[PDB]
């Protein structure tokens, strides 16, 4: 969940493009509005990072 | 100038060595006279290899480190050989050793070449002569 | 005719290293420029040397340098690979190979040995290949491809183990960050 | 018309502003202290350095952003890449990636003096790098190691604290015997890796400690040294460059500089914060690709981790 949608509209606008750019992986992710959990907070940094950036 | 002379058919003689600053070479092993200038510029300005300059210039004809080696591959034999020394001296060991005065022999022909490779060991590409001065210049390392 | 070949004392060096490494580096480049020619590859003759002054007086070959003409007459990649396959199968690892060390006057003789060595190890073969890849793709670009093509195939043509080797170059082009 | 520039190549967050002019009108860094990743570190100091920046300068007076493309690591280039196309989108601002070596001379060649031949020397990175027929390429460069990389990794075998730098170059200045270690330089390339195998070797061998960090220092400076003296003949260059995190030692400085004496050539380095890698190098050459025109897009900014020098284009030259 998000305190609201527009903030999770730009988080999203602004890491899926990152996600598009590894086409190999490991597993079935869901990303719309061992190995699998080090990826997963792979993303988890990537949206930090882009929230805080604001 | 130091005096190289090929004699053929000479006279070999121990006590020669008792008259004593003079080296005998054989002369089909030699190859020419380039082999015995580049022993002489070897001996003079390199470092000599042997207590005995003389003697050092059959070292350095050699190619190799050891001594008795060098004197049993190019130490002189009976009848053709090559004698370096410095006139009267010449005429003296001409005269005792004896032989008849050919240039030739030390020229380098198909057999002498044959020679030569087996002695030296030289497995390869190049000049014969070439390679002989470059195997004695090579003596310096190892 | 002969010409004079020396390992001048570079300043911005630390003097006793680098007398250490001219002698060194005069050493080796005798040794391996006199074996070669047992390989059959022309070179330049070895006339006198001298460790101490760092002087070494040999042959002097009249002929344009492979970097100069290798593009223009592509055969002479040829010629390299065959005398570089040479080498590898003889196991003397040139470690500088470029095609400057080189001449063609009318066979192609190797000038510099400089950091040659000998080793039976077919990743160095690799690596030493990589070098003269490298050198040849910043001197003539415009011509890597048909030069390291033709190059290879003297290489296959002298030498038989070349596939492994490059197989194993390969490897070692792989090696940059992920 | 100024830009805010990211360097997010490697262990230092360097967030910059440049002005057209040529001036700096902000610049600072963060070196990653390793004990997370340099990416981490990167995520977590933008917005830091970024607020910083704001606060000299309005944020709607910066006219573009610019973020250190590559060469470099992967998860670093990535959290620069998105911390640039988020302040792009929230400020409405064009964005551009730059190649952090190729800002590195750029850099070099504003705050110092034209066409340098540039020894990029750093922890990570080393290789001699010159413009030729019109595009910047490798002329020179490691096999396995950086040189850079190779002290360190040296600093920690010894347990020299890191950076290692400037403190084996403490330790030779007081050196005099040389140890023997293989010299390997191919061509116009350097295999650091055994140099630094023949240092552990000889650190096993009860060294003094001096005299193999000085024998050491001399190898691989030397080997730079007449690399870059290859790299001048074949390119004529006037003027070599030392860049990159390295160039702080004097040691190699004045070895190149005695090269340089001696081929009659001059050898240039920029001030210490410039050198390492700073924000203010990305922020000068993205400002100066845009002074010509290099127009780039959301799509267009993905990372390129093995960013090569030949890969770029260049027009502000």
């Given at each position: 969940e998000f305190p609201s949608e527009d903030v999770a509209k730009v988080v999203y606008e602004a890491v899926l493009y990152e996600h598009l750019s590894v086409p190999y992986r490991r597993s079935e992710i869901d990303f719309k509005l061992s190995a699998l959990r080090g990826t997963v907070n792979s993303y988890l940094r990537w949206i930090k990072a882009a929230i805080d950036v604001i | 100038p130091m005096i190289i002379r090929g004699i053929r058919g000479a006279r070999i003689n121990n006590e020669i060595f008792n008259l004593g600053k003079f080296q005998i070479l054989n002369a089909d092993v030699v190859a020419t006279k380039k082999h015995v200038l580049h022993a002489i510029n070897q001996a003079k300005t390199k470092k000599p290899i042997a207590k005995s300059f003389w003697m050092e210039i059959l070292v350095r004809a050699s190619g190799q480190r050891q001594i008795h080696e060098a004197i049993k591959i190019i130490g002189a034999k009976d009848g053709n050989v090559c004698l370096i020394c410095e006139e009267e001296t010449f005429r003296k060991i001409y005269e005792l050793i004896g032989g008849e005065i050919d240039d030739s022999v030390l020229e380098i022909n198909e057999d002498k070449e044959r020679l030569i490779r087996e002695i030296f060991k030289i497995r390869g590409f190049g000049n014969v002569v070439e390679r002989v001065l470059e195997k004695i210049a090579l003596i310096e390392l190892k | 005719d002969v010409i004079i070949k020396e390992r001048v004392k570079k300043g911005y060096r630390d003097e006793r290293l680098d007398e250490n490494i001219r002698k060194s580096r005069t050493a080796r480049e005798a040794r391996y420029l006199a074996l070669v020619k047992d390989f059959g590859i022309p070179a330049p003759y070895i006339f006198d040397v001298d460790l101490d002054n760092k002087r070494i007086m040999m042959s002097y070959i009249n002929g344009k340098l492979a970097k100069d003409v290798i593009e223009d007459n592509l055969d002479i990649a040829y010629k390299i690979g065959e005398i570089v396959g040479k080498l590898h199968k003889n196991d003397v690892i040139h470690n500088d190979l470029t095609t400057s060390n080189f001449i063609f006057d009318k066979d192609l003789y190797i000038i510099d040995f400089g950091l040659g060595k000998i080793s039976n190890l077919d990743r160095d073969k690799a690596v030493?290949?990589?070098?003269?890849?490298?050198?040849?793709?910043?001197?003539?670009?415009?011509?890597?491809?048909?030069?390291?093509?033709?190059?290879?195939?003297?290489?296959?043509?002298?030498?038989?183990?070349?596939?492994?080797?490059?197989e194993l170059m390969k490897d070692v082009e792989r090696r940059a960050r992920y | 018309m100024i830009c805010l520039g990211l360097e997010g190549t490697a262990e230092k967050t360097g967030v910059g502003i440049v002005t057209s002019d040529g001036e700096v009108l902000f610049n600072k860094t963060i070196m990653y202290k390793p004990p997370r990743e340099a990416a981490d570190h990167h995520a977590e100091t933008f917005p830091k350095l970024i607020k910083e920046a704001f606060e000299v300068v309005d944020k709607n007076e910066i006219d573009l952003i610019a973020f250190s493309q590559g060469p470099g690591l992967g998860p670093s280039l990535r959290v620069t890449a998105t911390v640039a196309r988020t302040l792009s989108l929230t400020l409405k601002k064009p964005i551009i990636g730059v190649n952090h070596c190729i800002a590195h001379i750029e850099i070099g060649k504003l705050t110092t003096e034209e066409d340098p031949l540039t020894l990029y020397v750093s922890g990570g990175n080393t290789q001699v790098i010159a413009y030729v027929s019109k595009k910047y390429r490798v002329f020179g460069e490691t096999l396995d190691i950086a040189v850079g990389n190779c002290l360190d990794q040296f600093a920690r075998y010894v347990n020299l604290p890191h950076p290692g730098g400037p403190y084996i170059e403490e330790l030779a200045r007081k050196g005099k015997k040389l140890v023997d270690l293989p010299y390997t330089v191919k061509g116009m390339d350097i295999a650091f890796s055994g140099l630094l195998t023949a240092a552990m070797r000889a650190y096993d061998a009860g060294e003094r400690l001096e005299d193999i960090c000085y024998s050491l220092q001399e190898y691989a400076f030397s080997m730079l040294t007449e690399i870059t003296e290859r790299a001048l003949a074949h390119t004529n260059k006037?003027?070599?460059?030392?860049?990159?995190?390295?160039?702080?030692?004097?040691?190699?400085?004045?070895?190149?500089?005695?090269?340089?004496?001696?081929?009659?050539?001059?050898?240039?380095?920029?001030?210490?914060?410039?050198?390492?890698?700073?924000?203010?190098?990305?922020?000068?050459?993205?400002?100066?690709?845009?002074?010509?025109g290099r127009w780039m897009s959301l799509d267009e900014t993905k990372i390129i981790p093995n960013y090569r020098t030949d890969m770029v284009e260049v027009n502000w030259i």
């Open positions: - | - | 030493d290949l990589i070098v003269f890849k490298k050198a040849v793709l910043s001197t003539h670009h415009e011509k890597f491809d048909e030069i390291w093509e033709r190059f290879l195939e003297g290489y296959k043509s002298v030498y038989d183990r070349w596939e492994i080797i490059l | 006037g003027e070599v460059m030392l860049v990159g995190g390295v160039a702080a030692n004097n040691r190699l400085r004045e070895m190149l500089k005695a090269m340089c004496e001696g081929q009659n050539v001059d050898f240039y380095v920029p001030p210490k914060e410039f050198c390492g890698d700073n924000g203010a190098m990305i922020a000068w050459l993205g400002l100066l690709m845009h002074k010509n």
